[PDB]
Design a protein around this ligand. Structure first.
Ligand code: A1CYM
Ligand code: A1CYM
Ligand code: CL
Ligand code: CL
Ligand code: CL
Ligand code: CL
Ligand code: CL
Ligand code: CL
Ligand code: CL
Ligand code: CL
Ligand code: CL
Ligand code: CL
Lengths: 493, 493
């Protein structure tokens, strides 16, 4: 990796290389011997801890309790269900030995914990007094996917949380499915300044055993690829029937539980980086940056040295007293411009420059990372203006990313309008009959039309919860049948 | 598992079965298809989260930053070092396939992350400005150990934290080694009410590449087996030489870094259960129990029902207003005695009984879990007395466990005195010359003397930091040579 000090690929001209440079030169990640596995350095894992604390706070209000189930799973429990999502079998890593000894029975590594947890649920669930059962895990899962691996986005091994619940009836379960989905929206908006779109995945793309799969969909405008930001399934009684999870209800009749399972991944970090990063490097919402402010001294005269270091330490004291973490870069070995690029690259939201002009005027210079706008601030008002500026940066990052998302969403009706939008790097909202047979024809056929890596087919992303009005005689864009609902389409990571 | 409602094995008469009953009937764990892997239910994982928050708070003060490295490791990096602790090779689980496809290169699952992290350290460490480097992981590791598996104590898969640091010189590193060790002591004392003994492991039992291995040693008096509660290694330059971790110092001379690595495990939970549990089931320090108080109504007259439920809800309001979580068990389906045993079994520190006698006297009955002592408390003073009683329970649990630890420590000098103590289930402090050749002779030979599961040999546990005075002509108990220091010996889990 060359030119460690700066980003030499513009986000638009070469988005792929720009992303690799940002995550490495900002010290978020490091690559690894094993393809698809990545080292989350402290800067990246700080982001994970912030969203982890937030999500834990909110799911505790729903009485979800954390837990930990084994990393390994027997070939019996896992492969016991070929009616659920058994498309993980080609991706399931198998341990076959310890040392030079071979295992008697092979054991797999969890791609997800549905079979591990739900094999014990019948023991914990005997009557309606035992429901609802609400569990969550903060763990690591493994999926061996031949598809091109992308840091944070499609990885062989990723940290996540997987919640699983079971309920007395349908109404209780589905309300939790969407309550979690809104927590995912806050996960992205409040802490990552990333807008998403709530929807319902088509029958073709839904989770294996799910009744339906709700999703939060993000979009990378620069390369026109949607990403499944987070997921919340209503499994209904499907999984309850497979694993014989039954309960005596209030009227002595035995019933199947209604289950959910929801998960969000370090993929949120990748989406955040792609949404806000620019050619100077990493851009962070203040809520996920360890250092909210960096104080850079700027002078040349040896006489000013003593006065300036004290003035900067005054600012460091004001901020840290107000619980605003910050770094005072007083390294004399590096030029002021080196410090500028170094901390812009690391994504520090705010830079406070202090120079001789500042001492006499009793002020400072404050520079927003998102737009590089500078302003003079009297020393007394530094604390308040810094607080309001961290808020304004977050408000600005979200609204800019929302403008880019909406500019990428185009509403069309005909097949030809759809392809023009598709090859212009847009996410297309079109009327669709939702017949499942049309999903594979649409994907396979659009790929043959998009002449000139990642999959080039146009999948159905999600059917938005927010439905624009459907005209009376509107026809599906592909089949010509009467159209049921508007659906989002596009290429995907 | 029979008699789910109570513990049918006395902790002394059958300690092994008593432990299995406690951890399952108190809903801490559930057994699993794969030997050595255990399900940490919410009650057990709440304990993990409390100590996890505490340890994270304190290591952040030392500027240790959390991170996450890959679960997998190549056969090259792992086996590159046969001079370090390569005794993990027989315990290293190997993935050899994904799906029906075989992997080109086999990949292992981390038993520990020394090789994973230290293969990247040279990239992050170029000069003295880059030191100290302080990293930590909250992750899961795997060791396939044929030894008899015990929940929380010796498991195939366990949660832990592994810190790793690198320093400019020896003084900086070793100070951190012992600073972490004291954090482990607070981990056990402050939050688990478990006393431990700081020591230095013998040269025979030290960690693979360590210069020395400091340890915190706990002791299960009932079955007379010591356990390695926590560990903190000074690796010195040993690992720096293996992985070529060098740095340009302040005087332009390249040097090797001085490293440490420290870890503590869910084994702390197992030690806590064994130390405080009694025949009624689980006994918890208040700091690791979700519910500090359980309010049980006790009446028979239908007339009293309305008044009593309001009186109990008043107490629930007082406690929860003071941030003292509690459960008001108003289930009319279960007898009051059922509730008593149910919540004593789950380890709730305090039970507040409310009956008709309480309403007229405007008081309540408070029952300590640790000693079942009951006392009347006027309703007004419930909040204060409850707070002081949670503190007194913790003070009592620690001091009781410390009395049992010290009664199990016996100081002897001759070989025959040592064996009498050994077969009386004691941890023996004896003078020892520390010659390494004597470690395998002592272990192998004491096993042949202890006539009539787990290893029956007497290992050297640790050489305490607190050294009682050594007489002038004191001779090692085994060799007759002049004795260097007092060392602890005993059987181990
Ligand atoms: N390969 C990857 N690389 C990087 N980041 C990610 C994120 C991924 C993902 C995230 C959420 C949900 C799903 S899911 O639809 O498979 N549902 C499940 O697993 C269910 C629900 C949780 C319990 N099991 C997948 S996969 C992946
Ligand atoms: N098999 C088991 N079952 C249940 N609980 C436990 C706990 C165990 C343990 C705890 C602390 C330290 C050690 S260590 O001495 O091996 N040192 C290392 O790994 C170093 C230091 C951290 C980074 N690598 C082992 S092993 C084990
Ligand atoms: Cl590969
Ligand atoms: Cl809101
Ligand atoms: Cl996906
Ligand atoms: Cl410079
Ligand atoms: Cl603004
Ligand atoms: Cl086995
Ligand atoms: Cl103290
Ligand atoms: Cl050990
Ligand atoms: Cl009963
Ligand atoms: Cl007391």
């Amino acid at each position: 990796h060359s030119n460690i000090l700066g980003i030499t690929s513009k986000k638009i001209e070469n988005f792929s290389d720009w992303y690799t440079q940002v995550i490495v030169k900002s010290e978020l990640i490091e690559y690894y011997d094993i393809s698809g596995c990545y080292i989350l350095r402290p800067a990246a894992y700080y982001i994970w801890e912030c969203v982890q604390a937030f999500f834990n706070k909110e799911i505790k209000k729903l009485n979800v309790e954390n837990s930990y189930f084994p990393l390994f799973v027997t070939k019996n429990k896992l492969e016991k269900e070929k009616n659920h999502i058994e498309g993980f079998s080609p991706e399931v890593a198998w341990v076959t030995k310890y040392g030079d000894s071979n295992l008697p029975e092979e054991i797999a590594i969890r791609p997800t914990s549905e079979t591990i947890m739900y094999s014990v649920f019948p023991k914990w669930i005997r009557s309606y007094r035992d429901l609802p059962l609400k569990l969550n895990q903060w763990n690591t899962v493994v999926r061996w996917e031949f598809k091109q691996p992308t840091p944070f986005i499609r990885t062989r091994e990723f940290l996540w949380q997987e919640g699983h619940t079971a309920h007395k009836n349908e109404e209780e379960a589905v309300k939790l499915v969407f309550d979690i989905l809104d927590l995912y929206r806050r996960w992205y908006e409040e802490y990552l300044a990333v807008p998403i779109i709530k929807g319902i995945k088509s029958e073709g793309e839904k989770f294996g055993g799910a009744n339906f799969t709700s999703t939060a969909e993000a979009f990378i405008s620069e390369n026109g690829r949607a990403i499944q930001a987070a997921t919340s399934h209503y499994l209904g009684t499907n999984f309850a029937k497979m694993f014989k999870i039954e309960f005596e209800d209030e009227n002595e009749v035995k019933q199947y539980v209604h289950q959910t399972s929801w998960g969000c991944t370090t993929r949120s970090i990748g989406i955040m980086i792609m949404t806000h990063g620019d050619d100077k490097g990493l851009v962070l919402p203040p809520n996920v940056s360890k250092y909210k402010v960096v104080i850079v001294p700027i002078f040349y005269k040896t006489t000013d040295e003593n006065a300036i270091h004290s003035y900067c330490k005054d600012i460091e004291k004001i901020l840290k007293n107000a619980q605003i973490n910050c770094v005072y870069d007083d390294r004399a070995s590096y030029s002021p411009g080196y410090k500028f690029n170094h901390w812009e690259l690391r994504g520090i939201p705010i830079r406070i420059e202090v120079g001789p002009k500042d001492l006499q005027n009793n002020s400072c210079v404050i520079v927003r990372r998102d737009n590089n706008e500078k302003c003079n601030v009297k020393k007394e008002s530094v604390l308040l203006e810094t607080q309001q500026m961290l808020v304004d940066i977050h408000k600005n990052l979200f609204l800019k990313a929302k403008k880019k998302l909406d500019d990428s969403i185009v509403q069309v009706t005909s097949f030809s309008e759809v392809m023009n939008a598709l090859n212009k790097k847009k996410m297309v909202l079109a009327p669709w009959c939702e017949d499942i047979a049309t999903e594979e024809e649409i994907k396979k056929e659009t790929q043959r039309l998009s002449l000139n890596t990642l999959s080039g087919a146009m999948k159905p992303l999600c059917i938005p919860l927010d439905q624009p009005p459907m005209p009376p005689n509107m026809k599906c864009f592909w089949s010509g049948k009467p159209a049921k609902r508007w659906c989002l389409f596009g290429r995907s990571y």
